[PDB]
Design a protein around this ligand. Sequence first.
Ligand code: ADP
Ligand code: ADP
Ligand code: MG
Ligand code: MG
Lengths: 57, 242, 371, 371
Amino acid sequence: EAEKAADESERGMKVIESRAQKDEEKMEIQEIQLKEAKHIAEDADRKYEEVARKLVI
Amino acid sequence: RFGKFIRIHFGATGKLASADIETYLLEKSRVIFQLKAERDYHIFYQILSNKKPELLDMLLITNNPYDYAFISQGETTVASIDDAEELMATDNAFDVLGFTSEEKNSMYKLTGAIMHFGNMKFKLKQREEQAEPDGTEEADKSAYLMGLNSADLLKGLCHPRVKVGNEYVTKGQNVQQVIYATGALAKAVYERMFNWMVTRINATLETKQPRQYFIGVLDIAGFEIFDFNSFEQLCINFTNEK
Amino acid sequence: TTALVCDNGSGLVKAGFAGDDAPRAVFPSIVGRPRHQGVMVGMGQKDSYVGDEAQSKRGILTLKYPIEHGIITNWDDMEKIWHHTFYNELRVAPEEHPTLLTEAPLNPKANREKMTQIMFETFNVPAMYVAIQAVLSLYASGRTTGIVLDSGDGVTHNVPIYEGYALPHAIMRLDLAGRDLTDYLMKILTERGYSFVTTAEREIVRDIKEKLCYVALDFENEMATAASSSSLEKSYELPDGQVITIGNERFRCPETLFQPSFIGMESAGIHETTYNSIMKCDIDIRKDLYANNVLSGGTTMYPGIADRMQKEITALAPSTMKIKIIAPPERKYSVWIGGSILASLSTFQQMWISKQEYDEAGPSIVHRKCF
Amino acid sequence: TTALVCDNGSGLVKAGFAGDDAPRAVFPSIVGRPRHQGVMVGMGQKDSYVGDEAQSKRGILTLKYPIEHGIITNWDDMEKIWHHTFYNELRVAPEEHPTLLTEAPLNPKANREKMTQIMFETFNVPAMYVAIQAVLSLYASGRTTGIVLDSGDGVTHNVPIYEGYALPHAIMRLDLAGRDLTDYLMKILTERGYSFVTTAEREIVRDIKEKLCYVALDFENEMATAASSSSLEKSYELPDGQVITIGNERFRCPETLFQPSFIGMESAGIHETTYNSIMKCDIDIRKDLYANNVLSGGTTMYPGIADRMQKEITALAPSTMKIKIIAPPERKYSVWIGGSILASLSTFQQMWISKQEYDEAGPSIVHRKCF
Ligand SMILES: Nc1ncnc2c1ncn2[C@@H]1O[C@H](COP(=O)(O)OP(=O)(O)O)[C@@H](O)[C@H]1O
Ligand SMILES: Nc1ncnc2c1ncn2[C@@H]1O[C@H](COP(=O)(O)OP(=O)(O)O)[C@@H](O)[C@H]1O
Ligand SMILES: [Mg+2]
Ligand SMILES: [Mg+2]
C-alpha cells in the first residue's frame, strides 16, 4: 500500500500541476484584461469630465 | 591558441634519446563564447563533414550547423581549409597509431555529446524560484550516449547534492546558475579529453631510452591586437607581457 | 594565506575555511561533565567532554549550553568550544589564519568586546572581524534587497536591507526560538503520558521535534480533523524501545511561532513582526521588501512554514501586492555560506581588525567604523 | 557647429541641441545623499545620486533642490547637475559647443555673474548667453506682442511685450509657484488622515497634485457640490497600496493661485496681478495686450485654468474689450522651443559672449550692454 499510495500521489501531483499551470495562464490573461478595462474606464471618465467642463463653460 | 611545448631528451653520451611533449594554457572560453566574425575549433566543423555518413546517423547528429546553438553564434563557415580530407587524414593518422578504433569512436561520440549540451532548456516552476526542464528528448539522447540515466542527470543538474559536516544536503539552482554549470561542464570535459589525448600521444611517442638533459621547444601565441579586444585577448596579452 | 570563517551560532557550532561551499565541521555546542563517581581504576576519564563527543556519552553527563540567547553566559565553556573547534575539528593553528565571527543584532557590547579579547589574547589570531547574521544570510541568498528572517535556536530577528543599506530603526528581535519550542514540546508531551525531565532527554525531544513536527496551514481545521481522524498519528522509536505515538501534538509545537501566547509571551507571531518591520521602513521601498522576503536559520526548516507565512502576510498586506517568500533548501547553513562569500572578497582584506590596531586602541576598537 | 539650449528652471532640467523640435533630455533637478550607513561591502556606493537616478532611490536618499526660487543656493549641487546634463544625458563634450541659458526676471546679479564664471571656468564653453524665460516663450508661440505668464515650479512672472519692445517698468514677479502648491497639498491632506513628512514622499504628493488636481470655474458652487454630493471624489494608488480618496481637497490646492491668502501671502491673485500689469502699461497698447494673453510653464497645465482665468480677467476688464487666452498643449516645453528657435537664428550668431571677450572684460561683461 505504500507503493500504491506513492503512485496515487504521483498522478495526483501531475494532474494538480497541470490544472495549476492552466490557472496561472487564466489568471495572467484576466489580469491583463483588467489592465485594459481599467485603462478604458479611466479614459472614458476623464474624457467625459473634459467634455462636461466644456459644456458648462 | 594552446601553448605547445616539446622537450627533446638526450642520452648520457650526448645522443638523441627520446621526445616528451606537453601542453599549456589551452583556452576554454572559445568553446562556448565566440566573436561574431570568428569560428570555433575546427573539431565541430570537421565532424559535420558529409563525406562520412555513418558517424552522423549513428550519433543522430543534425546535419544543419544552423540548428546547433553552440556553433551558430559565430561565423558558420569560411574557406580557410577544406575540412574533408583533413578529417580523413587525421582519422588515418589515428588509425596508423597505437590505439584501436573503439577509442576513436568514443572520441567522436563524446564530442557529439558536447555538441548536444546547448539544446538543454529550463523554465521556472509553479510558485517557486527553482528551475525545472521542459524538454527532455535532447537530455534523453545525451544520457543514452554517455551511458547515464536522463532522470539522474536532470536531478543532478537541478538539485546538486553537497556534503556538510557528516551529512549530505541538496542545494537549489535557478536558470542562470544551471546554464553556467552546463557551460562549465562542457568546457571541463573538453579540457580533460584534450589532456588525455596529449598523454596518450606522449605515451605512444615514448621510447625506452634514458632521459638525460633535455632541450625545450616552446611555441606560444603572439601579442594579438584587435579593434575589439576582449577577455580572451587580454589573457594572451598578459601572458606575452610576462 | 587563507581566511577562517567560524560561526558560533546557538546550539550548533559550524566552521570552515573561506572559499568553501559548505562548513567542514558541524557539531552541537555542548559541554558535559560526569555526574557520577566512577569505580574503574586506570581508564582515567577526562573531566570535561566537549562537542559531538558529549552526544555519545549523553547518558552519564549533564549537558550545559554555554549560551542562552545569543549572549555567552559561561565563558570558560566557550574557550573550551573554540579550542575544540580549532584543534580537534579543523586541526589548524589559528596563529596564521584570520577569523571571521558571526554575531546576532542588538546584543550587549561587552559580549563583542570579550569575544575579540579572547580571540586576540588566548588564540593570538592575527586578525578578526565580527559580522551580523542577517547580512551574511542576504549574501548567500544572491540578493541585494529584501527583508530576511533569521530564526535559529537562540533568537529570531528581522533585518530589512534595501540596496545594501540597512534600516537600523526597523530591526525587530524576538527571543522565541527553537529551544523554547523544545521546552513547549516537553510541556505538551506530558499530557499524553510521556515525561522528559533530564538534560539528556532534551536531545531526544529535540530529535522528535526535528523528525516529526510540521506547521499547519490552518489551525482550527487541522484540530477538527485530528479530533475525529487518526491519520495524523505517527510513531517514534526511542533509543531503548517503547515506541510513542503523537497525534495533534506534532503540529501544535511549531504553532508557538505564530501563536506566542501558548508559552505566555506577550509579543506577536513572526508573521506579524515581519509585517510590522516592513511598515517601519520608508514607503518607497515596501514593494521590494514585500517581493524579496528571505528565510534562513534552522527553525525555519519546518515543512509548510513558507506557505503559512505567505498566507498570513498576504492577509495582512494590501491585496494589490505580490508576496513572494524565498526558502532555499539550505536555510540552515545560509549564514556560513554568506560568511565564506564575504571573507573571499578581495576588497574585504582592508576591513580586518589587525593585531596592531587592537593593541593600540584596546578592545573598544570593535565598535568603530569596523563594526 | 551646433548650439546647446539648457533650461535649468527649478525642479526640472531640460536640454537639447538647437534646431531640434523638442528637448532631448528631461529629468528632475535633485541631488540625493544616502542617509544610512550601508552594511554590504564591496558594492562601492557613490556618495551622491544625481538626476533621474535619485528618483529610483527615493527610499534611501534625502532630496535637496539646488534651486529654491529661481536663484541657485547650493552651487556645488548645481555644478553636479550641469556636469550630469553635459556628460550623461547628452553625452557631448561642451568644449566646442555654445550654450544658451535661461533665468527668471528680477534676479540677483551675483547669480548671473557666478553662473557665467562657472560656465567659462569649469566647463570652458566657447560662448554662452542668458535669455529671459518669458521672451523665449513668446518666440515659441509665433507672436510678437502680448503678455506671457510663465508659472513654473520656482517663480511666477508676467512680462508685457509690444511689437518686440519689452516694458521693464510693468514686469510683475510673484514667488507663488508649484512648490508652494505641493506644500499646501501636503498640509491639507492631513485633515483626511494621511501624513506626508519625508522629502521622498513629497514626490508622491506631487504625483497626486499633477494627476488629480484641477481648477474650478466657481469656488462656492463647487464647494457646495462637494459638501452635498460625492461625485467629485477620486482614488489614487500609493506605491505601497492602501488606496486613498481625495474629495474637496481636489480643487482646493490649485485655488491658491487665485487665493494667495490660503498660504498667508498678502499679494493679490494671478488674475489680479495680470490685470494690474496690463493697466501698468500705456493706453494705446492695452487692446493688443488683452487680445494676446500667453500661458506657459508647468503650473499652468491644470484642467480648466484657462476658462477660470479668462472669466476673472473679463470680469475685471471693460466689457467692450475682447479677451483671449492662448493655451497651447505644449506649455511645459514652450520656453525650450523658443530658446531653440532663437539659437537657430542667423542674426543671433553675433550676440554670443566669446571667451576672449569674457577674459578681457571680466565676469561683469554679461550685465554690460553686451548682454
Ligand atoms: N528539519 C528541521 N525541522 C525543524 N527544526 C529543525 C530542523 N533542523 C534543525 N531544526 C532546529 O534548528 C535548531 C538549529 O538552529 P541553528 O541554525 O543551529 O541556529 P544558530 O544558527 O543560531 O546556531 C535546532 O535546535 C533544531 O531544533
Ligand atoms: N498637469 C499638471 N498638473 C499639476 N501640476 C503640474 C502639471 N504640470 C506641471 N506641474 C507642476 O509644475 C512643476 C514643474 O514646472 P516647470 O515648468 O518644470 O518649472 P521649471 O521650468 O522652473 O522647472 C512641477 O513641480 C509640477 O508639480
Ligand atoms: Mg544562526
Ligand atoms: Mg521655467
